[PDB]
Design an enzyme around this catalytic site. Structure first.
Site, short mmCIF file in Angstrom:
data_model
loop_
_atom_site.label_atom_id
_atom_site.label_comp_id
_atom_site.label_asym_id
_atom_site.label_seq_id
_atom_site.Cartn_x
_atom_site.Cartn_y
_atom_site.Cartn_z
N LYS A 11 3.78 -10.35 9.80
CA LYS A 11 3.28 -9.39 10.79
C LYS A 11 1.75 -9.37 10.78
CE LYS A 11 2.76 -4.78 10.92
NZ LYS A 11 3.20 -3.57 10.15
N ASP A 59 9.09 8.69 -3.56
CA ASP A 59 9.97 8.08 -2.56
C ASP A 59 9.90 6.55 -2.60
OD1 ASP A 59 11.65 8.10 0.03
OD2 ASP A 59 9.83 7.03 0.67
N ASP A 60 8.68 6.03 -2.71
CA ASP A 60 8.46 4.59 -2.80
C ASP A 60 9.14 4.02 -4.04
OD1 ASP A 60 7.01 4.49 -0.41
OD2 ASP A 60 5.08 4.65 -1.44
N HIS A 108 8.69 -3.92 4.12
CA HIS A 108 8.31 -4.18 2.74
C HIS A 108 9.52 -4.56 1.91
CE1 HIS A 108 5.44 -1.12 4.30
NE2 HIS A 108 4.62 -2.11 4.00
N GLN A 152 12.86 3.85 -3.70
CA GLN A 152 13.26 2.69 -2.90
C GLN A 152 13.25 1.40 -3.72
OE1 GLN A 152 12.27 2.32 1.39
NE2 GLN A 152 10.76 3.92 0.93
N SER A 171 6.21 -0.82 11.43
CA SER A 171 4.92 -0.42 10.94
C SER A 171 4.99 1.08 10.73
CB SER A 171 3.83 -0.73 11.96
OG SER A 171 2.71 0.10 11.75
N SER A 172 4.34 1.57 9.67
CA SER A 172 4.35 3.00 9.40
C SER A 172 3.69 3.77 10.55
CB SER A 172 3.65 3.30 8.07
OG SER A 172 2.35 2.74 8.10
N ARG A 173 2.76 3.12 11.24
CA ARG A 173 2.09 3.70 12.44
C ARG A 173 3.00 4.01 13.61
NH1 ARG A 173 -3.46 0.35 13.16
NH2 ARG A 173 -4.20 0.48 10.98
N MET A 201 0.84 -1.18 0.00
CA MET A 201 0.00 0.00 0.00
C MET A 201 0.88 1.24 0.00
SD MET A 201 -3.11 -0.99 2.53
CE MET A 201 -2.09 -1.54 3.88
N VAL A 239 9.96 -7.93 10.14
CA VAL A 239 11.15 -7.14 10.32
C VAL A 239 10.86 -6.24 11.51
CG1 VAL A 239 12.67 -5.41 9.34
CG2 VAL A 239 11.66 -7.21 7.87
N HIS A 287 8.66 0.71 3.96
CA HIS A 287 9.74 0.64 4.93
C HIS A 287 10.49 -0.70 4.84
CE1 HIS A 287 7.10 -1.85 7.31
NE2 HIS A 287 6.22 -0.87 7.41
N1 LIG Z 1 7.40 -5.16 9.70
C1 LIG Z 1 7.02 -5.90 8.66
N2 LIG Z 1 7.70 -7.03 8.37
C2 LIG Z 1 7.34 -7.81 7.34
N3 LIG Z 1 6.32 -7.50 6.56
C3 LIG Z 1 5.60 -6.38 6.80
C4 LIG Z 1 5.94 -5.53 7.87
N4 LIG Z 1 5.07 -4.50 7.87
C5 LIG Z 1 4.21 -4.70 6.86
N5 LIG Z 1 4.55 -5.83 6.21
C6 LIG Z 1 3.87 -6.40 5.06
O1 LIG Z 1 3.69 -5.40 4.04
C7 LIG Z 1 2.42 -5.69 3.36
C8 LIG Z 1 1.52 -4.42 3.53
S1 LIG Z 1 0.34 -4.14 2.16
S2 LIG Z 1 -0.21 -5.98 1.42
C9 LIG Z 1 -1.85 -6.38 2.08
C10 LIG Z 1 -2.91 -5.42 1.58
C11 LIG Z 1 -3.86 -4.98 2.50
C12 LIG Z 1 -4.86 -4.09 2.08
C13 LIG Z 1 -4.90 -3.67 0.74
C14 LIG Z 1 -3.95 -4.12 -0.18
N6 LIG Z 1 -4.00 -3.70 -1.45
O2 LIG Z 1 -4.86 -2.65 -1.82
O3 LIG Z 1 -3.18 -4.29 -2.44
C15 LIG Z 1 -2.94 -5.01 0.24
C16 LIG Z 1 1.84 -6.93 4.05
O4 LIG Z 1 2.35 -8.14 3.43
C17 LIG Z 1 2.43 -6.75 5.44
O5 LIG Z 1 2.35 -7.94 6.23
#
Ligand SMILES: Nc1ncnc2c1ncn2[C@@H]1O[C@H](CSSCc2cccc([N+](=O)[O-])c2)[C@@H](O)[C@H]1O
Ligand SMILES: Nc1ncnc2c1ncn2[C@@H]1O[C@H](CSSCc2cccc([N+](=O)[O-])c2)[C@@H](O)[C@H]1O
Lengths: 276, 272
Positions: free
Chosen positions: B144, B72-73, B46, B76, B180-182, B39, B171, B43
């Protein structure tokens, strides 16, 4: 799994047909899928023949009475079905078990859009969720280039186009015109449940629809009233619905759909309508 | 004609058809298509997904960036050597609005589905779409969001999808806090207290030699030592998120609120 070209190959295991389909696609054959619930008649054979005419095609016909769109009363004749497929030169029949298709019961499923709540879905609000769930699965198992459905079940065809569009499925949906008896009666496995009298009266559905299609130069009201008059003149035809809709089942070009009961036997038919 | 693709560059496509066409063309040339759904706001968590996808021999990596209803994304991803970014609009993904959707099984109503009963229907619908657009050989998700990962495995099994689902370990920051971005919203006191989630989970994983109750009690003690940490759940389940068996493998999941910031974490547990 073995595949013998120019012969009918029957697979029950989803993995087997998936493997064979993948192999065949890799060698350049275009995979055609004709999903059926068996009890095959000339209407189904029209689907098969449409599939066949696609050059380089390999035709997969699935036969599966899907419990989720319902069941004990449904016509089952597997012997005859495969014989017909052999006669038609179909190379693949896919005949999965309920256990292989639903090892986890109903867990993840397809939720159709609001059209599924209407017409056929009115009294059967889970019916099309059943149909779309199984068709999605069949499409993922077989990965056909094209999938073939009859226009007789027009709402089903529309919903399958919705499934395909909405989930970005890489398959073309081919609608095949309804095959009819000499008098116009839409072919259906449910026709066997009509006695001589009901069979005679049942012509009123197609007669009403074709009357409407020709009345339609005079407008929608004329078309509908023509159909209603024919159905009203039919002994022992009880109408569930008679509805004129846009072709996408939401004026100019439309579809007129009828569902009626003759005794316990519920019959469907529909027709293209051009207004004016 | 197949859309332009420049090997070894980041190729960005916004049209579902374009990425579909390129993915199909690439797989025919002997690449293995790897999908990493995101999304955006990328970080290191991802990036770990991206790196897992990259190490598959023959990989071409497709990272989608989509918010289910930027430079930025992309920088990366470029730096990670990703060759495909897929950045569709909402209108391109949902040209007919929400019509046909995926109805998850009952697990979707549990745990994260408590506060958000339709959340996972949204996630499975968009994941199914991305799978059908890109047709990857493998799709990568972080552990996660363990419940999400389990639900995607159910989606793939239930709909007979021909893709391998790869879970990638969470991670973490230096002190164990799951990335987490939060996390950025946490004030210093909250950021300090947030360590209790991971500490509780790792304590539980080590306590588990003494059994399931010891593991749960250890985790709860750690959470009980933290101020301003409102625990929404702390649940030990089997690895598919059914009921925990008497022994064997399980997963311990926690969710908590620190002010308005909701944090999740989970850990493998081996009972006894
Ligand atoms: N700290 C971390 N370590 C490993 N993976 C991580 C993480 N933080 C986030 N992720 C991983 O990064 C990904 C985040 S987005 S993929 C799931 C999703 C949900 C809603 C909508 C949509 N969509 O519109 O395509 C997609 C997850 O695979 C998360 O588990
Ligand atoms: N008279 C006729 N003319 C043309 N086509 C006809 C027809 N009568 C029937 N058909 C066509 O023959 C097919 C009948 S079964 S395919 C739809 C379906 C629903 C649920 C489950 C499964 N499934 O488990 O694979 C399949 C329909 O395409 C019908 O429209």
């Amino acid at each position: 799994p073995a595949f013998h070209p120019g012969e009918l190959n029957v697979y029950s295991a989803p993995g087997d047909v998936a493997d064979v389909s993948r192999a065949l696609r890799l060698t350049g054959r275009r995979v055609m899928l004709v999903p059926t619930m068996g009890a095959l008649h000339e209407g189904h054979l029209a689907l098969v023949r449409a599939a066949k005419r696609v050059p380089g095609s390999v035709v997969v016909v699935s036969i599966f009475v899907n419990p989720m769109q319902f069941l004990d009363a449904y016509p089952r004749t597997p012997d005859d079905d495969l014989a017909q497929l052999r006669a038609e030169g179909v190379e693949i029949a896919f005949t999965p078990t309920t256990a292989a298709m639903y090892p986890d019961g109903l867990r993840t499923t397809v939720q159709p859009g609001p059209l599924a709540a209407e017409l056929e879905g009115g009294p059967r609000p889970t019916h099309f969720a059943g149909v779309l769930t199984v068709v999605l699965k069949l499409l993922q198992i077989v990965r056909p280039d094209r999938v073939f459905f009859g226009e007789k079940d027009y709402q089903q065809l529309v919903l399958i186009r919705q499934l395909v569009a909405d989930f970005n499925l890489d398959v073309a949906v081919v609608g095949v015109p309804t095959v009819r008896e000499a008098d116009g009666l839409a072919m259906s496995s449910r026709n066997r449940y009509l006695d001589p009298a009901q069979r005679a009266a049942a012509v009123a559905l197609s007669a009403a629809l074709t009357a409407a299609a020709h009345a339609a130069t005079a407008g929608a009201q004329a078309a509908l009233d023509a159909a209603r008059a024919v159905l009203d003149a039919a002994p022992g035809v009880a109408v569930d619905y008679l509805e004129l809709r846009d072709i996408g089942l939401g004026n100019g070009s439309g579809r007129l759909l009828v569902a009626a009961r003759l005794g316990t036997t519920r019959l469907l038919d529909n027709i293209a309508i051009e207004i004016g």
